[PDB]
Each structure stands twice: as structure tokens, then as C-alpha cells.
Design an enzyme around this catalytic site. Sequence first.
Site, PDB file in Angstrom:
ATOM      1  CB  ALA A  36       0.155  10.458  -4.297  1.00 53.13           C
ATOM      2  CE  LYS A  71       8.090  11.790   4.343  1.00 49.74           C
ATOM      3  NZ  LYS A  71       6.647  11.956   4.062  1.00 49.74           N
ATOM      4  CG  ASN A 103       2.255  10.035   8.531  1.00 49.14           C
ATOM      5  OD1 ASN A 103       1.889   9.048   9.166  1.00 49.14           O
ATOM      6  ND2 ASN A 103       3.092   9.954   7.507  1.00 49.14           N
ATOM      7  CD  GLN A 116       4.036   3.401   5.002  1.00 51.10           C
ATOM      8  OE1 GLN A 116       4.797   2.713   4.313  1.00 51.10           O
ATOM      9  NE2 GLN A 116       3.041   2.877   5.708  1.00 51.10           N
TER      10      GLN A 116
HETATM   11  N1  LIG Z   1       0.759   8.734  -0.611  1.00 52.86           N
HETATM   12  C1  LIG Z   1       1.781   9.485  -1.043  1.00 52.86           C
HETATM   13  O1  LIG Z   1       1.511  10.612  -1.472  1.00 52.86           O
HETATM   14  C2  LIG Z   1       3.252   9.032  -1.049  1.00 52.86           C
HETATM   15  C3  LIG Z   1       4.330  10.013  -1.614  1.00 52.86           C
HETATM   16  C4  LIG Z   1       5.767   9.515  -1.609  1.00 52.86           C
HETATM   17  C5  LIG Z   1       6.087   8.165  -1.081  1.00 52.86           C
HETATM   18  N2  LIG Z   1       4.975   7.320  -0.568  1.00 52.86           N
HETATM   19  C6  LIG Z   1       5.400   5.984  -0.066  1.00 52.86           C
HETATM   20  O2  LIG Z   1       4.944   4.948  -0.956  1.00 52.86           O
HETATM   21  C7  LIG Z   1       4.832   3.686  -0.256  1.00 52.86           C
HETATM   22  C8  LIG Z   1       3.581   3.075  -0.868  1.00 52.86           C
HETATM   23  O3  LIG Z   1       2.463   3.774  -0.377  1.00 52.86           O
HETATM   24  P1  LIG Z   1       1.189   4.186  -1.266  1.00 52.86           P
HETATM   25  O4  LIG Z   1       0.956   5.618  -1.090  1.00 52.86           O
HETATM   26  O5  LIG Z   1       1.363   3.755  -2.729  1.00 52.86           O
HETATM   27  O6  LIG Z   1      -0.340   3.374  -0.645  1.00 52.86           O
HETATM   28  P2  LIG Z   1      -1.635   3.614   0.099  1.00 52.86           P
HETATM   29  O7  LIG Z   1      -0.819   3.736   1.318  1.00 52.86           O
HETATM   30  O8  LIG Z   1      -1.839   4.686  -0.850  1.00 52.86           O
HETATM   31  O9  LIG Z   1      -2.412   2.224  -0.236  1.00 52.86           O
HETATM   32  C9  LIG Z   1      -2.476   0.984   0.447  1.00 52.86           C
HETATM   33  C10 LIG Z   1      -2.063  -0.018  -0.627  1.00 52.86           C
HETATM   34  O10 LIG Z   1      -1.677  -1.263   0.014  1.00 52.86           O
HETATM   35  C11 LIG Z   1      -2.275  -2.348  -0.634  1.00 52.86           C
HETATM   36  N3  LIG Z   1      -2.660  -3.317   0.388  1.00 52.86           N
HETATM   37  C12 LIG Z   1      -3.697  -3.268   1.304  1.00 52.86           C
HETATM   38  N4  LIG Z   1      -3.693  -4.364   2.032  1.00 52.86           N
HETATM   39  C13 LIG Z   1      -2.641  -5.155   1.605  1.00 52.86           C
HETATM   40  C14 LIG Z   1      -2.128  -6.449   1.980  1.00 52.86           C
HETATM   41  N5  LIG Z   1      -2.715  -7.122   2.964  1.00 52.86           N
HETATM   42  N6  LIG Z   1      -1.007  -6.973   1.317  1.00 52.86           N
HETATM   43  C15 LIG Z   1      -0.384  -6.285   0.291  1.00 52.86           C
HETATM   44  N7  LIG Z   1      -0.879  -5.052  -0.073  1.00 52.86           N
HETATM   45  C16 LIG Z   1      -1.996  -4.494   0.560  1.00 52.86           C
HETATM   46  C17 LIG Z   1      -3.353  -1.916  -1.574  1.00 52.86           C
HETATM   47  O11 LIG Z   1      -3.181  -2.733  -2.706  1.00 52.86           O
HETATM   48  C18 LIG Z   1      -3.098  -0.371  -1.749  1.00 52.86           C
HETATM   49  O12 LIG Z   1      -2.527  -0.108  -3.024  1.00 52.86           O
HETATM   50  C19 LIG Z   1       4.810   4.012   1.199  1.00 52.86           C
HETATM   51  O13 LIG Z   1       5.852   3.382   1.837  1.00 52.86           O
HETATM   52  C20 LIG Z   1       4.926   5.569   1.321  1.00 52.86           C
HETATM   53  O14 LIG Z   1       5.838   6.064   2.270  1.00 52.86           O
HETATM   54  C21 LIG Z   1       3.546   7.767  -0.558  1.00 52.86           C
END
Ligand SMILES: NC(=O)c1ccc[n+]([C@@H]2O[C@H](COP(=O)([O-])OP(=O)(O)OC[C@H]3O[C@@H](n4cnc5c(N)ncnc54)[C@H](O)[C@@H]3O)[C@@H](O)[C@H]2O)c1
EC number: 1.1.1.8
Lengths: 348, 348
Positions: free
Chosen positions: A152, A203, A269, A297
Site C-alpha cells: 500500500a 505468499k 508479515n 493475513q
Molecule cells: N496493506 C497492504 O499493503 C495490502 C496490499 C495488497 C493487498 N492487501 C489485502 O487487503 C485486504 C484488506 O487489508 P487492508 O490493508 O486494507 O487493512 P489493515 O489491515 O490495513 O486495516 C484493518 C482494517 O480493518 C477494519 N476493522 C478493524 N476491526 C474491524 C471489525 N471488527 N470489523 C470490520 N472491520 C474492522 C478497519 O476498519 C481497518 O480499515 C487484506 O486481505 C490484505 O491481504 C493489503
Amino acid sequence: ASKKVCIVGSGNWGSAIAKIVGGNAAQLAQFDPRVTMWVFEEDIGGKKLTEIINTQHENVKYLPGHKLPPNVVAVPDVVQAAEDADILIFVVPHQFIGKICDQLKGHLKANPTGISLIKGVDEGPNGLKLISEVIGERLGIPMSVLMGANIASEVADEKFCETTIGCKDPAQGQLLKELMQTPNFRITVVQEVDTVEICGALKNVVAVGAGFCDGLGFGDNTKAAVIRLGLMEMIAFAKLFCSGPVSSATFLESCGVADLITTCYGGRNRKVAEAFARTGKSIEQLEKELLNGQKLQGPETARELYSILQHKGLVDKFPLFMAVYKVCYEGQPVGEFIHCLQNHPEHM
Amino acid sequence: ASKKVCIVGSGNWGSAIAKIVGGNAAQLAQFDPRVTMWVFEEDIGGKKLTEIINTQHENVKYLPGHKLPPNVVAVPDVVQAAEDADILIFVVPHQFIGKICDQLKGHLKANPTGISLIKGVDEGPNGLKLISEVIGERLGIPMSVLMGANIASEVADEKFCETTIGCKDPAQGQLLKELMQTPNFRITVVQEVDTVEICGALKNVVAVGAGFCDGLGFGDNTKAAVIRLGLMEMIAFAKLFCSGPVSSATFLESCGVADLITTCYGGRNRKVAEAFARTGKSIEQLEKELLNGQKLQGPETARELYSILQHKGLVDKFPLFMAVYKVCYEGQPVGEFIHCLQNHPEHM
Ligand SMILES: NC(=O)c1ccc[n+]([C@@H]2O[C@H](COP(=O)([O-])OP(=O)(O)OC[C@H]3O[C@@H](n4cnc5c(N)ncnc54)[C@H](O)[C@@H]3O)[C@@H](O)[C@H]2O)c1
Ligand SMILES: NC(=O)c1ccc[n+]([C@@H]2O[C@H](COP(=O)([O-])OP(=O)(O)OC[C@H]3O[C@@H](n4cnc5c(N)ncnc54)[C@H](O)[C@@H]3O)[C@@H](O)[C@H]2O)c1
């Protein structure tokens, strides 16, 4: 008519995606400029996060130093957020998608389609079960996925990179690509949906081990090996538990080798897994102490792998995956990790 | 009867290999304890390097902070060092192999064998010509290769890593594995020599490109894509220019993905590539100012791929490789590198 887009999720990635989707919806005619983003409500210093997002147009808690396009609107109720959407981007932590399909079930538009960015795996009474499947089944809508080396913070800084979109329907693929692509976010649409999605989930387990190795004091030659062996198991795993066709050529896409690399070097991670190796605190504790609310994750996905492998009595076939699982949850000393590398089969 | 070994070369890698080869030779019966190492004589402040090595048992200039096994003897005359050798490990900067060879021509034992660790490629009348092939034909001896993610400094620090041995002969393959393997230097023997050797050669060209991106201020997602697009061009290049079968699997070996990764993150080509992107000094000048004698194999290899492709009229088929070559030798602005990724084909 222009398509309405709803972003279900608002974290590190969810917010970054909002910038990309917000920007494209506003500049593109085929997409409705109004883009909703479901935001799990939170109280921050007495102010409501949704309020802060719509007022200051930024979700600094999860995506520091960045503004979100004004047209992305934060909506606390998921149903309201998705109600009139034609395309739904599912991007929330694995452990909440379940309950979200709860409320959404039956309250979506007729021909609404969806794309998942969630990395992890689920289990079915009969083998592995992809998150995208579970979502598409419960909500009854056509599903696609987006997977690639997309930490991100780098994406939000508009630093050149790529990603992979898995979609069977060409027309839909070209559609999702127009919605997601950017001069610095280059997309390649692919049809082997399952393989592209499992590359993303698996991964992260590999990255936990890579993180362990850093915490043990090792360098690049070692991380390269962990990446290399984990890839061996990833392909072995996909060819075994995935339905129908699974080609290795698919792992050479952004979703495979590239995502594996960037994650082992700069993913959350890797960081936590490194601290786990040093301090001895719990994955959970370090998660809360270091990620300011963001979700790992990696570990839980390993846990899921374990369950999937045992129900098939094949726990001994994936040393590296299981070694990651055992150190995170069984109490196995991190100092034995190297061992799974030293005795890893030469081929699978 | 034990086999006497001669290490032709004594550089960064040559010295590390000496530690590994020196150790196993002393410990294993099938190998004669006396290990000769040809050392291009140098005047280190009035003292001959060979004299320093045989006295202090260290080649600090090229492998700092490490000792060499006492049984590894530095020999200034290559003919004398190789004379009684049954096995010859060719490990010298690409630029010096040709001259060494005609010196050795007609001075090796009847059934002497050799393994090459040199990374680069040459050109024959019609197309590609592998270094190991050039050595084998000139010296009239069977050849093998050793290629993998092996940053010397780390291998010398005994940090876990792997390597790939390309050998057509099984018996010779097992023997070479016994001479080279270590509890922390894990070997996998494969028979696809050609492909293994081409991987070592080509990945440095990609690493020069990775260094460029670091020098442009980019992070991991960009490096990942650089590695990924680089691999695409590597396979396409190998399948097109290599004699005989070229499987994609072979690239999943240490010599492929792994070395690609470790080199792009901690290799000498990356370091110089970055300094080049920043200072604007010549590669040659940076090589002299930064590697205290060590030699980069990446830029010259790109110069070679250009020669090969320009003889087949396919310079336009490998954007990334040629972009690396052009930035290194034509004066193309480094900032223009991302442009070869943004417009890079999706498949080859
Ligand atoms: N971080 C990265 O750089 C990245 C890059 C590619 C894909 N992803 C994927 O994106 C997916 C989303 O992850 P992310 O990075 O946006 O989040 P985070 O992991 O960045 O944030 C936690 C989020 O979960 C929410 N949350 C907390 N408690 C909660 C609850 N009880 N019920 C519902 N929501 C709650 C919050 O609103 C917050 O937005 C993941 O599965 C991950 O694999 C992340
Ligand atoms: N450095 C690494 O970590 C590493 C890892 C795997 C493979 N390799 C490969 O090994 C090969 C050997 O490289 P290296 O790292 O040992 O060397 P260097 O690049 O570490 O050293 C330069 C060496 O060349 C010699 N030399 C200088 N001028 C010479 C001349 N005029 N004639 C003959 N010799 C001369 C010096 O004696 C010195 O030992 C390379 O082709 C490289 O690709 C290196």
C-alpha cells in the site's frame, strides 16, 4: 449508463485503492463519479472516523500522509454503501468478510459484479475454499480478483508497479482494468482466476518465514532461498488442492513471484515475523503493538493451510508452510526454522 | 585415488569457494588435501599477494574478515597450479578467461574435468556461445556449471543458501556436489547445463536495471516488477538463443529466481547501478571507485546481448535488457528506465 462503484473496506490497502478508484471514477465517463467506501465506524478522539474522512478527506490512521479523492464518500453502514453499486471491490481483513456478506446478502443490485483483493484461504467440507468463491456464492454475483506486489504505502506514493486481475469474462476484465489501471499501476488481466488468488494467500505464509530468517540474522542469499522454496510449495499446493487447470506460467505473473518478493522484503508479515523471532511476544501482541490496528493475513493463513492439509492427512508434504505454522502457533523455537530449509525436498 | 583440485581464480567469490573447497578437500578422502589456487600476482605494498596468502592465509583485499584454509595454496603461474589437477574450478572475471585458457591449452591432465562459475556469455559465428562451452572446446575437457543466489560475503559468513550445479554426467554431478556442498551451502544437481549457465549470465543485466530503479528513488514493488519483467525476458531469450531444450522449470532453481532476487537486492551490479543513476559517472569509473578491484559482470553482459541481438536484428525484442544496455553505454537518461517497464509487453 455509468457504473456505480462501492469499496467495501477502508484500511491500508482499502484506502490506497480508494485513491486509485476515486481518481479513475472522476476522470472516466463509464464510471459514476460518486464512489462509496464502507468504513467500519471508529471513535478517534471523540470524532467519528467516517466524519473525519468526509470532512478532511483522509484516513491517516491507516494510510498516513495521503489525501483521498473528495468524491470517495465514507459510509458507516455496509448495506447503504453497497445498495446501488454495480461493482463491489471487497477489500477488508479476512476475518470480517464473513460477517459482511451477512448484512449484504440479498440487498445488492440485480447484475452487480464483484472483485476481491483479500489475501487468504477458506476451507470447505470438501477441500480448499477460495474467499472469492464464498463471497460470490453467498452474494450470488460474478467474481474477479486483484492480486500483485502492491504494498500500500508504495502504491499511495504512486511508485511504479503492477498487479494481476483474474477474471474469466473478457468484457468484465477490460472493464475492471479501466477502473483500476494507472500510469503507475499497470494491470494484466488473466483468466486462471483460482491460481492468481491462491498466489496471494499463500505468499504471506512464505513471508512470515522470510521474516523469521531476518530475525535470526540472515541476509539476501537466505531470503532468496526461502522465497524459492516457498514458491516450490505454492505451486505444489495449487496443483493439488485447486479445482481444474493450474499452470506454473501463472506464478510468473505479478501475483506470484513478484508479490512473493516485495512481501518478503517489505510487508507487514515480514516485520512482525522478525520481531516474533527476537522478542518472543505473541503474533497477536506484536500485531497490536506494531501495526496500529492493521491486520496480518500471514499467520492465520498458515493456520488455515494446516487445517486443510490435515483433513487430507498431508501435513508432512509442506515442511516450510508447516514450519511457519508451528513456530507461530505451536511454540516451536524459531531457531529450528533453518532446518526445514536444510532438508526441504529438491522438487515437489 | 584422490582427485587433486585447482581453483582458477582468487577473487571475492574465488576466495569464498576456496574456503568451501579447502574445507571439504581436507575432510573428504576422495579429494587430495592440497588445493591449488591460481592467483593473478599483485604487488600489495612491496609484498606479493601470493606470498601474503600463503603466509597470512587470508585474501582480505577481496574477501575481508575471513581466513582461507591453510591447505589452499596460492600459485602465481596458472600452468603450475592447474598442471596436476583432475578437477578445475573456473572462477575468474569473465574478461580474463580467454587468455588464461590458451595458456592452459595442452597442459592439463588427460582426464581432467572442469566446472565454471563465471557469469556472462560470448558470441560465436551464428549466435550465442556459452563461456563454459568456450572453455571446454579450447581446453578440450568436459564442463559443468555452478550457478545460484550466492553473494560471496554471505557464503563466507556461513549463512544458509543454495546453488545449482548443471552437469550432464550423473557420476560427475555427484562428485562435484561432494566437493562443493556444505551444511549451509546446499546443492541441487540438474542436467540442463545450458539453461543454468544462461540464468547466471542474464540475471546481472536485470540487477543493473534494479539498481537504476533504486537510484531513481523507488521501493520494493518496483524492484519486484523489475525482477519479474526481467525473468520474462530471460526465459524468452534462453528459449530463443540456447541450443537444445529449455524448460521454464529450470528457472525456478536457485540459478534462476533466487539469484535474480539476491543479486537485485545486495549485488555489486545493483550498488554500482544505483551510483550510476545518481552521480552520472561512468560505470568503469564507478567500478574502480567502489569495488576496490572487484569486477562487475552486468554491464559488459548487456553490451554482449546487444551484440547478439543486433546480429539477429532483434534488438527491439528485449526492451528491458536493451534499456539497461542503452543507459549503460549510449547515454540514454536513467529517468527513462521506467518507460521500458510501463510499455513492456505482457508476455513473451
Ligand atoms: N496493506 C497492504 O499493503 C495490502 C496490499 C495488497 C493487498 N492487501 C489485502 O487487503 C485486504 C484488506 O487489508 P487492508 O490493508 O486494507 O487493512 P489493515 O489491515 O490495513 O486495516 C484493518 C482494517 O480493518 C477494519 N476493522 C478493524 N476491526 C474491524 C471489525 N471488527 N470489523 C470490520 N472491520 C474492522 C478497519 O476498519 C481497518 O480499515 C487484506 O486481505 C490484505 O491481504 C493489503
Ligand atoms: N562476488 C560474488 O559474490 C559472486 C557470487 C557468484 C558468482 N560470481 C562470479 O564469479 C566470477 C569470479 O568473480 P569474483 O567475484 O571471484 O572477482 P572480483 O570480481 O571479486 O575480483 C577481480 C579478480 O580478478 C583478478 N584480476 C584483476 N585483473 C586481472 C588480470 N589482468 N588478469 C587476470 N586476473 C585479473 C584479481 O586477481 C581478482 O581476484 C565472476 O564471473 C562472477 O560473476 C561472483
